[PDB]
């Protein structure tokens, strides 16, 4: 049962190379994750053996491609514990999923005086679609405040959500702070006030079990590329009764039933929301990523990331002049700054040592402003990373601090 | 220079297999095309060697992925002869591209009394977004009529387009009739009346050179999966001056410049229209499909398809009780019916002989109604198909006709 990190790393060809003369140390999985051979070879087999368009079922390869595509829909349903494949919509990624809710749910259900409630830690994907939806409807956007450690208190949620709130939208896991938000209790507060809750799960799904029946979220969005799967593919989950009453966000072939000159009728769910030839190979590859993660065990992967996170926080606390943002209890990532060194220069120096991290605002400018910084650096961990890699990171941070103090 | 079909077919692993005990005869490339090793191995190399998120440029693999993604944008620009990469937007496919024009251009620029003009041969992707855009604006949808052979006469275009027309949307090549429409002359008519022209090029781009400066189209949409490229990726081309004045269709990270609590500003083109982590691998694979087709020569591929089309029409005319739809001059496809046999049964019997064709409405229900049929069968050709494969098709059609006459 227990995961062998050597055996896991063996499955990721891209980890086994040098950058600038040093073994690669890839600590940027919160930006995008690497892929095991089981996923890459799923794409290969699709294109080598049974590519064809789907949902015709009139010739043999087309039936195979259809069975592969719809089979992957069912894999996703089981993976997040949705009641029904009608609730599982394949999209281009988390961002498009959230935009579909903002176009098809928010803009149809917001009036002046209604509120959309988000938080200061949201990724832009979970901010801009609501800014545009409230502007288009004359509704009001509101922000739940954060505690000093970058978590959300339920009393602040209760204070911000009111009888005029129609939508609460919030991240399951922050890509910057590592905070795991109390989604299940926030959904109960949202429903008690007459609101739906929209959960941005791009950063939770790769790393921890999702059960949308236990969360009782109304909508849940995720991206394949962060969870060992292909780029260009994501999921929107929504409760069937909500999706049934929402109009499509996109129109075209495959999502219609009858097309007249001026009027058309739509397919049943989920295909109502899948216009045009779908992301056939990428969805099948996302199903393979799910099989891969489930065979390792999401709970095993969470325990491994908890170990790496606690080890990294401890070793970061051994460095002088380094500031870490966010709470002690966290997902597998550390966002930080070195005193006196711009995080872009940190990242540049670290890449010269083979170490890949991210520097910038991480698509969370209002959070940087809340943190009173212009930018930060971020190291993020996944199921193929090790404590030795964190040692290399903290050693390179120490030698970065020494380098820049002495150039001065 | 001249293409060797044996050497071309050698590059497509999927062609070399049996279905039901017969060599595969894949005649469904108008639904989706197969991929050469150069494309599949491009995806492999991406995932094996340099996957990372794009447009950070802070670590070595991220710079490589960015250079690959933006390099593919430039490959597409050269391929359709656009003036600028600002004009090349990566989307999920033709359908999404056309929906982006309908959301961001049509719904912003249509008033009561304005007209959107389409044709009776359009694919649903080029029909439903306009039905929805005119309903949302109170504008009027109009249809250019067709000649008896399923072509469009320019005098009918001139009669249908008026001083109230703001948009003409039309396919470059019909996926059913094989008609090549007179796009360049239609664009001059559209502009003479104060309209833009939106060209659905999903079926022309795989098969013939596109030059958007010579066409003078305002928007042009295409899909990677029909042109030897990965699924899940497409392009929207639009004249820079039009795109500059259109608002994004999707909102999120990557397409912003500044994000405040309530207001945001957008990136320059093309990234204004690319919200969230992009279709990194698929776009790079579409660039490889372009390199592959350009090395063979689109003019060579067009000549090969013209030969196969003229051969197929002749051999179809040798069959009794078979009706072919559309004009003599055509792209590489034949849509037909057997007297007395439902096209679904034709397709089923043909798959038992290893032959893959499509039966149905081909996402063109108003065209089937114009043709006074409920469904049709369709065989479609690409650069790996041969005359021997067309012989197998017409022989299997003859034996289908004999089989069903004798069961009766």
Swiss-Prot record, chains A, B:
UniProt effect for mutating residue 363 to A: Loss of cysteine desulfurase activity, still binds SufU and Cys
Known catalytic reactions: (sulfur carrier)-H + L-cysteine = (sulfur carrier)-SH + L-alanine
Class of the enzyme per the UniProt entry, highest EC level: transferase
Record-annotated active site: 363 (cysteine persulfide intermediate)
Activity control summary: A Cys to Ala mutation in SufU (Cys-41-Ala) has been described to be a competivie inhibitor of SufS activity and a non-competitive inhibitor.
Domain of life: Bacteria
GO process terms (BP): cysteine metabolic process
Alphabetized UniProt keyword annotations: Pyridoxal phosphate, Transferase
Residues the record lists as N6-(pyridoxal phosphate)lysine modifications: 226
EC number: 2.8.1.7
InterPro entries given in the database record: Aminotrans_V_dom, Aminotrans_V_PyrdxlP_BS, Cys_dSase_SufS, Cysteine_dSase, PyrdxlP-dep_Trfase, PyrdxlP-dep_Trfase_major, PyrdxlP-dep_Trfase_small
GO MF: cysteine desulfurase activity; pyridoxal phosphate binding
The protein's required cofactors: pyridoxal 5'-phosphate
Subunit structure and binding partners: Homodimer. Interacts with SufU; this interaction induces an opening of the active site pocket of SufS. Interacts with frataxin/Fra.
Function of the molecule: Type II cysteine desulfurase that acts as the initial step in the SUF-like Fe-S cluster assembly pathway. Catalyzes the removal of elemental sulfur atoms from L-cysteine by using the cofactor pyridoxal 5'-phosphate (PLP), resulting in the production of L-alanine and persulfide. Activity is stimulated by SufU, which acts as a sulfurtransferase that receives sulfur from SufS via a zinc-ligand swapping mechanism and transfers it to SufB.
PANTHER family on file: CYSTEINE DESULFURASE, CYSTEINE DESULFURASE 1, CHLOROPLASTIC
Family: Belongs to the class-V pyridoxal-phosphate-dependent aminotransferase family. Csd subfamily.
Stated name of the protein: Cysteine desulfurase SufS
Species this protein is from: Bacillus subtilis (strain 168)
Taxonomic lineage from the root: Bacteria, Bacillati, Bacillota, Bacilli, Bacillales
